[PDB]
Amino acid sequence: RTRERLVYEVRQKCRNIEDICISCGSLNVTLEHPLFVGGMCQNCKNCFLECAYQYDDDGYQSYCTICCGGREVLMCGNNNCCRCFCVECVDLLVGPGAAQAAIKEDPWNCYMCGHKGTYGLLRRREDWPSRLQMFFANNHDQEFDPPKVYPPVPAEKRKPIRVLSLFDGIATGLLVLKDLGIQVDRYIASEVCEDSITVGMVRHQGKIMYVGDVRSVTQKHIQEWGPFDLVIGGSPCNDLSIVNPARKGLYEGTGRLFFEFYRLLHDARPKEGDDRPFFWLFENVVAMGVSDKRDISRFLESNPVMIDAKEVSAAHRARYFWGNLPGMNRPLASTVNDKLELQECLEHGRIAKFSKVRTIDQHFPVFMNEKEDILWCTEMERVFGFPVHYTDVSNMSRLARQRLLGRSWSVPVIRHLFAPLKEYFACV
């Protein structure tokens, strides 16, 4: 309401729209809104960090794009666009009579997809993908020192890498290390779900020395399993995301398991004065809490890097990566082997309407034989850059196997991250 009074005052040319927070009408303007014209307070920044990449079961956004809240949202009819604009923001930025008349417009495009681009009170700021990329470098609220850069070991002195992988899953980390041609001395992997154990056992030919639960692992185990050169892991994002209908908590269950990664990182870290190269990668999902993100950054003593897989693969897989791997910041390059269109990842005889996929109306992405159908499991493997037929090991159901594929890291993203480790360890 105060929002609406302030925008009323702005249309009289008495107040600048850039001097007011367009999300909630706050006067405490610190930032500028990245997509559209207006200011941006810090509470709306925290709400924007939490809510922007949240999507309903629909596939469209959980909340409004402008204020990350709202009451009733207006979903976009344009293809592959999932944005929603609540009625209260369109009462301001387009007018109090144009929302009602725009609902009646049956082919309705949203204002990020509006072919014209310019409107009266609302105009779209031009370099908005650049500002969306800069907005996560704008997260300097958590200020830290940069990760310590170790000088490279000569090529004749290099040795096979040793990896402690927590929350292994289907052994994406070891696979990506074998794709890069790095010699792996040993790969210790703690994991609980039998199916993922079985996927890793078969696809990596008994090389992985498997363990039990992460919680059972003691520092004595860490010491006695040799010095580790690379510790990798990712917290469960089944409960942490808004996509699961059963959100009883937020950091019950998953939160604990993050601290298990934290502890075994301090157990596997070499002492001060031991200047041997040691590296670590944590992974989490972007649709997370702010104070959650703060606590993670503070425990791991680092600024997260957001990496979206759209730059290299055929999915929208935006994930945080904490770590000290060299060149974690540097921009993503997609090789010619990587498929940037969904249609290339399809089987023959199938034609996709989408160019990128959202796997958790249009819930089933494929029009084959004038019929709506789910991606096949081997295609979901192709979307994330896995080798073909990667998960067809054991007699498991399709729902379980899709669920086994959907938790996994995106393979070309993890190749992009792990690639400068070749400079430090031996090759095949």
Partner: protein, 347 residues
């Protein structure tokens, strides 16, 4: 036979190391750490039990040679907690010495001053180290155990205390200064923004302390969050590797995190909780769960207090209308062994 040794050594010209000075046994498991002589196996066990046991007022609980609390002689050095017994002083130092010592009332003990002529009892050199080595080789499952510091080598103790100020307690334990404006303890309420650089800027620390709040919630942040923040800032306040100086840490719980979060905490602090109750009239008034490395923290444990009774206590104390008080007296005596490591003074 405690009395027989005076014949055995003098007339039979026999080494003190071949007999047990603590009781008069002739079969010795090993040698006595503090003084010249052997020691037999039950006395060895008795000694290791009693080792760092003190009394509530401040002084050592048992007799420093033989671990007899029945009779006690208090030493007259304000920087010495060593208390003895009569049977030893007359048995080991000659027939009429304990009564003379008792009549002196300004008597420094053997470890204080050796200048006084001694009949048979000889003080081992370096004995602090010998004590440490004895505990190492002779304790079953030995623990994090630091050599005791000579009294002139005792510096003031540097305390970090998270979520609870312990200035009042340790000052009343004479460990902290009442006359200083530069505080020798750094209390922090909110640690949320704290970085490793910040804990390092605040200086090195000797003791780290952190505790969950009582039942009246100052804030709604869950009790696991305090534990994890403690673990982090604890890993920050650790001394740089290669440090011989004694570093300690003590986490305290006022029954406020459940069994699941308790299991998580037991894992992350790498030992099982020590429950230390307040029992009045036989009745369980209060209790507190601890984790620490402080000597003889684990022999204060009470295995009589069951988990169901602690759940009943938590239920009864949550549903009362009284404001929550910090249970000072339960963890107060759990800092007494640091007397033997750090500089005391009390006016």
């Amino acid at each position: 036979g405690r009395d027989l040794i005076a014949y055995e050594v003098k007339a039979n010209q026999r080494n003190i190391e071949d007999i047990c000075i603590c009781c008069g046994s002739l079969q010795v498991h090993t040698q006595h750490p503090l003084f010249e002589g052997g020691i037999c196996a039950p006395c060895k066990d008795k000694f290791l039990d009693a080792l760092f046991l003190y009394d509530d007022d401040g002084y050592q609980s048992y007799c420093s040679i033989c671990c007899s609390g029945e009779t006690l002689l208090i030493c007259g050095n304000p920087d010495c907690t060593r208390c003895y017994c009569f049977e030893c002083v007359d048995s080991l130092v000659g027939p009429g010495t304990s009564g003379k010592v008792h009549a002196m009332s300004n008597w420094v003990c053997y470890l204080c001053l050796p200048s006084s002529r001694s009949g048979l009892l000889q003080r081992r050199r370096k004995w602090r180290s010998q004590l440490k080595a004895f505990y190492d080789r002779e304790s079953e499952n030995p623990l994090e155990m630091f050599e005791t510091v000579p009294v002139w080598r005792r510096q003031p103790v540097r305390v970090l205390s998270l979520f609870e100020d312990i200035k009042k307690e340790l000052t009343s334990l004479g460990f902290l200064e009442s006359g200083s404006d530069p505080g020798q303890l750094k209390h922090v309420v909110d640690v949320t923004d704290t970085v490793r650089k910040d804990v390092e800027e605040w200086g090195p620390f000797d003791l780290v302390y952190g505790a969950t709040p009582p039942l009246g919630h100052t804030c709604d942040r869950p009790p696991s969050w305090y534990l994890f923040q403690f673990h982090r800032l604890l890993q920050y306040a650790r001394p740089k590797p290669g440090s011989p100086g004694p570093f300690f840490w003590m986490f305290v719980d006022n029954l406020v995190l459940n069994k699941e979060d308790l299991d998580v905490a037991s894992r992350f602090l790498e030992m099982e909780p020590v429950t230390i109750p307040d029992v009045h009239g036989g009745s369980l008034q209060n209790a507190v769960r601890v984790w620490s490395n402080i000597p003889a923290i684990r022999s204060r444990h009470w295995a009589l207090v069951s988990e169901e009774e602690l759940s009943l206590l938590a239920q009864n104390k949550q549903s009362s209308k009284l404001a929550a008080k910090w249970p000072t007296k339960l963890v107060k005596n759990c800092f007494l062994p640091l007397r033997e490591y750090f500089k005391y003074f009390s006016t």
